[PDB]
Subunit: 314 residues, 3 copies
């Protein structure tokens, strides 16, 4: 069926950690997506600035949500102030470079192309301009969720989380604007490992929020470029894991691998209030390089699941 004969729907995309609403369609549609590539200076950590290359102004790019069988029409613009061309490779797309050749766009230009989402899953998209590693390492990646035809189960809370490793010339903590360091990248020796582009992006005042009793689903991406994440939530167990973001489901998992350029979906029920910490359990990444997020859960205590310190004695 030609895509021009399908009803046209403007995509609802979200900035991390938000997720677009679930799709209540039982028929294919032509989904129009607008993306802009912007090079901009942002805060990586306290007193540390970095020149990010972004989809739509932050890291990761905005999340896209479509249904298996949809045609995705992408209007791809590269901001005039950009120093280099950019494009996008959708791991959800079947064909040359996942769309990279069709979306090769110089600064001040706009490209359009479309692809059919043939297979459900949770797919990384990222820039593929040479040198690809640099474009990825500077923050050009995001997730597109392709729902199964029948949809996914309903859950109370959904979060959008993408891990990435960053390579600065100075050591972590070195102040000022820090340029990209190709040698550390080739050596796979990052200074920062973060969720959603920046240290503390989903921690402290920016923590994720939920209420006791709610079911939580996390769409977890790994833009890399290099590291593989042992993803874990302190204080919780994964009721379900879509292994490597695929169809296969594992259960009762404490820590699951997220491949580089890959993904995973994890689900768990937050039973009792508390502060839950997302980490890459290659643990020195979490507590020394920034691979640390927080989930605030409010509600009524339940001693039957866990008690506090009942006593301390000599």
């Amino acid at each position: 069926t030609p895509a021009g004969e399908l009803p046209v729907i403007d995509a609802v995309t979200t900035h991390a950690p938000e997720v677009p609403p679930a799709i209540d369609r039982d028929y294919p549609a032509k989904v129009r997506v607008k993306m802009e590539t912007v090079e901009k200076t942002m805060k990586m950590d306290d007193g540390v600035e970095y020149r990010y290359w972004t989809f739509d102004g932050d890291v990761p790019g905005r999340m896209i949500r479509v249904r298996e069988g949809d045609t995705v029409e992408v209007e791809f613009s590269n901001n005039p102030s950009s120093t280099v061309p950019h494009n996008v490779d959708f791991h959800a797309a079947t064909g040359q470079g996942g769309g990279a050749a069709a979306t090769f766009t110089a600064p001040g230009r706009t490209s359009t192309f479309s692809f059919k989402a043939l297979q459900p899953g949770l797919y990384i998209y990222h820039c593929a301009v040479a040198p690809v590693g640099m474009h990825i390492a500077n923050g050009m990646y995001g997730l597109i969720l392709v729902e199964p035809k029948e949809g996914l189960p309903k859950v109370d809370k959904e979060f959008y989380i993408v891990q990435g490793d960053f390579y600065t010339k100075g050591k972590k903590g070195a102040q000022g604007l820090q340029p990209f360091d190709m040698d550390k990248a080739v050596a796979e020796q990052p200074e920062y490992v973060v969720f959603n582009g920046h240290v503390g992006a989903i921690a402290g005042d920016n923590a994720l929020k939920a209420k006791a009793g709610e079911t939580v689903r996390m769409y977890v991406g790994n833009g890399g470029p290099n590291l593989v994440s042992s993803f874990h939530v302190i204080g919780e167990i994964f009721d379900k894991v879509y292994v490597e973001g695929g169809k296969l489901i594992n259960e009762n998992v404490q820590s699951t691998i997220v491949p580089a350029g890959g993904s995973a979906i994890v689900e768990f029920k937050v039973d009792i209030p508390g502060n839950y910490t997302l980490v890459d359990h290659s643990i020195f990444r979490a507590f020394n390089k920034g691979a640390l997020g927080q989930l605030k859960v409010e509600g009524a205590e339940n001693p039957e699941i866990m008690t506090q310190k009942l006593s301390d004695t000599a």
Copy 2:
């Protein structure tokens, strides 16, 4: 309320016996944190921080739906506080906040084991990486309500990476090296705390024809293990320690802060070698264990060298 049962815990590589119970119970566990100097390798000493005096901590075995009440003691000679985060526990820090214990003090708390699996537990005192890197980790097995299938031999194996200021082989007491840890460049990668801890005279033992199950933990702090047994194939793998079962696997990933269960039947006698198949860890950094199998040879499965010609 629930009947109270004293936990049977075991020092690696031993495993507690399977649970013959069909009802929930309150299982009492005693844990002590002890800082002590032990041998890492020939002529190399290390200041370990341990649960119950060695690395890994003692294995705990409970049943889905049990209440686990932990009596947590910190030796008076300890220099810092310690606690425990059970990946099996649901709630704040897996119990870390409730078990924050200064030297010479005892804490108690409890949690219900809601989900079966094989869960790492470890200290979570800041700086978390250092407490883990010094050896404070172990495994707790939460059986399914119906139990696990019977096997002849069960082993308790936990990999960890260690960071010494001196190069591997440097003699004497070797302090923890924060810079190498942050860089993820360990000097030692071992099973159960020390080079040779389950090799040579400390090898695991079985008999030909017996079914073997290994509960494999990875305390990290940083490395991911490509776990493999030289000379054998995994008939079953509980993927990442979860419910999903894989079969006919030669090498399986054990995530950092994660686990795996593998099963295989040892068909013929011989020495079978446990390794992290990121192989320079095994044969240069110490990630090497041995399973000695006794019994009658069988040429139909494998022969010795049949001929040597020019």
Copy 3:
């Protein structure tokens, strides 16, 4: 006893024909270990240690329940002994002890392939890591008794990490660098022994509409691959080379000393890139292959650039 059959082995990226046998057989395999200098990249030489003259070794294909008889020769020009450990073999060293062969000698031994799967084989002479790092690894496929599903194209792909004294790009003969190996800091990461071994004029080839299966091994010694095909999605993944099947996976882990099988149908023409998606390995260290697919375009699946405006 058993009928005797001479093995059909293949040079990468080719795969032996599927087995149309419904009965067990004695499959005779001849292997020779050869040390030889070859091109790693433009103007870069390396002293490879090989099974049968290249990296990886030739692929072996047998049926579950077969007896594999190996005639193992070590070329007289070799400087050290070599052997082979089959991850498919059950028993001492996977055959390493039985095939320990000095230069100019020949060893024979046999093993029964008890379990189906896709198994790494590699040399295990001390120092094991160096023998592997110099290129001594390959794959043996043990079919299930009922065989595998039919596919149009089958490819044989093995990733390996290499450790040279000089930085990648340094011209001339590059010796093995033990220090970088222990640090797991490779200069080259390649498919099938060399930069470009399956790219450009050596690219893999298929036709639009064909189903493709890749037998993907990771000889290591150290790295774990996030295997990905740019422009495609894995319809099927035999997780870690085992019996378990995943679907709709973009990137799958290949453990060190492990394997994976992936399947996908190439719908439209184009150049598809095999990479380790630890992406600096692909575009800076050489872990890059190409699958060129010819056929008729289909804008319904993907279009070219439809417009370029201001």
